[PDB]
Amino acid sequence: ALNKKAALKNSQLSRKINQTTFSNNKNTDEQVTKALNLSHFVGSALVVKNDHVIYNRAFGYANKAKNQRNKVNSKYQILSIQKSMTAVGIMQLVQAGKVKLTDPISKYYPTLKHGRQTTLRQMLDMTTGFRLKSGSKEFLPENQVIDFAAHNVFYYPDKNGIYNYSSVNFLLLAGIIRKVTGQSYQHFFTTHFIDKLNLNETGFLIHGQGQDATTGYRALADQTLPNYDQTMPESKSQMANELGTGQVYMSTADLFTVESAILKGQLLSKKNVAILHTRTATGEYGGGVYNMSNGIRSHGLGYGYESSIFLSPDGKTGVVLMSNYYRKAAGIQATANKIFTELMKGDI
C-alpha cells in the first residue's frame, strides 16, 4: 500500500544522496547540511575526522508542543546500537576468564529444549535459530524479562549457523551478564560504560531522560515531511523488554565516545576487540556490529526513532546520526553511509 510507496521514495532519496558531489575544497557545513536537508532530517548529526569534530548540528524539534528544538546535546534512543555494547560486555567476561565464546547456551539456560548447542559466539553474530516473537505485555523486572524470553523463544533449525537478525540473541546475552556477575544489566552497563567513560548524557529510558530530552514522533504511511501531529508511544513493558537490545538513550557525542573507546582498546584488549568484531561466512555481522572493509556500522529503528553510526577501524573517523522522527520514506542510514564514504576517501 503506502508501505510499498515509502520504500520507493526512500530508494529515490538514496539515489539523490548517492549522486551528491562532495569536494574538500568546499565548506563541510554546507555539503553535509545539504545532504541532511534532502532527507528532511530531524535530530542531531555528528561527523568526526581524526578525532576532531568537523560537523555538529541539530534539526527540527525535540518536543514541538513545548517549542523545544533539537540540540547538539539532545538525547536519543540508540536502539539496536546497544547490542554492540552488550557484545563488549560479554567479551569483557571472556577476557576476565569468566565465560568462553564456545560455551553452549544450555550452560546458562538449562530449561531450553531445542538449540541447546548454540554457542555464545553464534548469539553474538546473529547466526542462531532462536526468535522471540513478542515480549510480555506487562512490565517485568529484569530477572522476569529474561525468564519470559527463555520460556517463550522459538527455535528454527533451518536458521542455525546462517546470519539472520534476531534481537532475542542479545537479550539472552544480557541475561548471561546478569547470571555470571550477579549484577543487574543496568548496573553492569552503568559501571562499565557510563562511569568508565564519563558519559553525562547516557541512561535508561525507563528512568527518564532528564534534561535535553526528546519526544519520539509517529509518521503516517509514506510521509516524508515532519508534521509532529502524532507522538509515538512506548510503554514501560516495551522499555523493559529491550533489556540488552535497545533501552538506552545517548547524545550523539556519548554514542561516538563509546564506539570509539571500544575500537581504541579502552574497554577490552585490541586483540579481543578483533576477535569479537569478526564477520562470519554468511554475513558482515559479527560481535554486535556489521564489519566492513572500511570500519563498522550499526543501525537501530523503533519507537519513532532511528539511529546510525559508521566508524573507521581505528575509531577516529565517523558519522553518528540520531533522529526522533523516523520516516520509512526518508530513512537516515543511506545519508550517514554516503557521508562516511566521502569522509573516508578524503572528500570532506
Enumerate residues 6+ apart whose C-beta is below 8 A from 286.
Answer: 124, 125, 276, 277, 278, 279, 280
Helices (H), the chain: 2-18, 28-38, 83-95, 120-125, 142-152, 168-181, 185-189, 236-240, 252-263, 270-276, 333-345
Report the candidate in 129, 120, 169, 165 with the shortest Cα–Cα distance to residue 149: 169
Are 223 and 326 within 8 A, CB to CB? no
Sheet strand arrangement including 285-286: 52-59, 43-49, 318-323, 305-311, 295-302, 289-292, 285-286
Please name the amino acid found at residue 16: K
Are 178 and 143 within 8 A, CB to CB? yes
What CATH number labels 2-78+209-345?
A: 3.40.710.10
The CA angle 221-222-224, to the nearest 5 degrees, is 120
| Rounded-to-integer distance, Cα 76 and Cα 28, Å | 24
Residue positions in the annotated binding site for sn-glycerol 3-phosphate? 80, 242, 301
Residue positions in the annotated binding site? 80, 242, 301
The count of C-alpha atoms lying within 13 angstroms of the C-alpha of 75, restricted to the half-sphere facing its C-beta, is 17
What CATH number labels 85-181?
A: 1.20.58
Stated resolution in angstroms: 1.9
Hey, where are the domains in the chain? 2-78+209-345, 85-181
Distance in Å from the first CA to the final CA of the chain = 39
| Rounded-to-integer distance, Cα 240 and Cα 209, Å | 15
Are 106 and 128 within 8 A, CB to CB? no
Q: For the chain, how many residues are written?
A: 348
Sheet strand arrangement including 248-250: 76-77, 248-250, 203-204
